[PDB]
Automatic annotation (TrEMBL), chains A, B:
Co-factor: note: Binds 2 iron ions per subunit.
Protein name (Swiss-Prot/TrEMBL): Ribonucleoside-diphosphate reductase subunit beta
Keywords assigned: Deoxyribonucleotide synthesis, Iron, Membrane, Metal-binding, Oxidoreductase, Transmembrane, Transmembrane helix
SUPFAM superfamilies per record: Ferritin-like
């Protein structure tokens, strides 16, 4: 039975990703958020509610990535060095999820926080998008999985990591790029720094598996990936309209969703699907 | 679908375990092992070989705990705050496993390190003892698991990290308690500091599940647990004879194995099985 040996490379990249993930280690106690109270209180109630809602959705996605996505993908890997990096990534999803609570405890009353988790837990769009992603992960709950099943779980993980978070990341970046909620904006920027590297790494692993598929299974997975892309897109378009119609930003965020969906695809070594468009410089300045 | 909400307690202990696990965070790059070369080179051939053999075994066990044990147990938990702790613990098993390589790269040649991993990978005792523990984890590879199956996976996990590692931990501690290989002994003490709290935590969760079992399943699990304890003890007696006969420390290590088996039992809220004996004061000083 094999032990992990870091003095003999199992691949060309797991060590550098390991070192970068651990270099980027952080926890919420390193950022005081209370100085955001000042700008929080100058936001309209629509702006506040949008911010809370998006953070709630992000919390849910990270809870699923830490609790199901990284653990079930990593258990089936044979590459012990790569497994290690995914275990570390998995812990950081929990650090991310807990981070949002740290922001909530400063910006919202105990009752307002109950409100938001009730809204998450009962939300039909969040349930649909989480249900879809996690159905690929739950296929892995069996002793032996096919390469195709593992590949599609990794596509789903990248689509979560690189694509589905961004309808949520948009708004904290937008506010931070205007000097509002800048402490919370820092925390969001730490999460994004981690997720950028998560997405690349999982996408490298997927590309490896794809090369081990037959020409046929390669076609089947391309067809499934395009369908998954578009089913999530339709959910995301409904989610952005729900969240941002009150504040006039639906078209802005839609551009940023498509931009990030193309980044996910590129992480998988696939061609972009959406035409390039001008993304808001204020959110680029919040990055 | 539920998101983790750290502003409402899901139990009355996960938060303090989360904080302590993260307070204890460390990385191998924080301990330079090069000052150990001095004492390494004054060890006899028998001593050097026993040290490399035990570090090899420990590398194997941490590999399985990070790669199967924490992930499969955590995925079935419903408590989202507890899940989070276990995912953090899972990443630190990979930090543990990688730390042994860090010790190896300073003490041993590339060829010497190949020799060790060839020996761990083909070792029949290490295979049997890993295989026994990992068989409880592999039962969890299915959509629905029983309370009984989860409980026995948690017993196995505590048996691994409160009991099975200690036939290995003994030697680094025994050397470090004589002022030898003290830098490596630091890294071993950091691993033990983690494992000590991993064990307590998994055992709290096991006790919770045991309370949700029927009286009859409670009896069945008590029986399985005692049988498991003793099957592993027999394997440990063979391992300790193989490793420590050459250096005159078999009876010393056997006492430390029993002591730590009693700790594992106590972590599960069970009675100790072995008499209290005096453990080698030199390993206590290494700790
Ligand atoms: Mn995350
Ligand atoms: Mn991630
Ligand atoms: Mn460990
Ligand atoms: Mn452990």
């Amino acid at each position: 039975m094999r032990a992990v040996n870091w003095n003999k490379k199992e691949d060309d990249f797991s060590l550098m990703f390991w070192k970068q993930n651990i270099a980027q280690f952080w926890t919420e106690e390193e950022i005081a958020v209370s100085s955001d109270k000042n700008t929080w209180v100058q936001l309209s109630k629509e702006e506040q509610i949008a911010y809370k809602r998006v953070l709630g959705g992000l919390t849910l996605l990270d809870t699923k990535q830490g609790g199901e996505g990284m653990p079930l993908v990593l258990v089936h890997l044979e590459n012990l060095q790569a497994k290690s990096v995914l275990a570390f990534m998995g812990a950081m999803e929990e650090v991310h999820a807990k981070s949002y609570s740290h922001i909530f405890t400063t910006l919202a009353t105990e009752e307002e926080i109950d409100d938001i988790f009730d809204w998450v837990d009962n939300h039909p769009l969040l349930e649909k998008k989480a249900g879809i992603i996690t159905s690929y992960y739950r296929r892995l709950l069996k002793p032996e999985v096919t390469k195709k099943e593992l590949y599609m779980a990794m596509v789903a993980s990248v689509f979560l990591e690189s694509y589905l978070f961004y309808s949520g990341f948009f708004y904290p970046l937008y506010l931070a790029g205007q000097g509002k909620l800048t402490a919370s904006g820092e925390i969001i920027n730490l999460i994004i720094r981690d997720e950028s590297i998560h997405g690349v790494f999982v996408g490298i692993l997927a590309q490896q598996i794809f090369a081990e598929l037959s020409a046929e299974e390669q076609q089947e997975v391309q067809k499934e990936t395009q369908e998954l892309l578009m089913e999530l897109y339709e959910i995301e378009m409904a989610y952005t309209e729900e969240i941002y119609t009150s504040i006039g930003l639906v078209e802005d965020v839609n551009r940023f969703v498509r931009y990030n969906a193309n980044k996910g695809l590129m992480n998988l070594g696939l061609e972009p699907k959406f035409e390039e468009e001008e993304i808001n410089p204020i959110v680029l300045n919040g990055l």
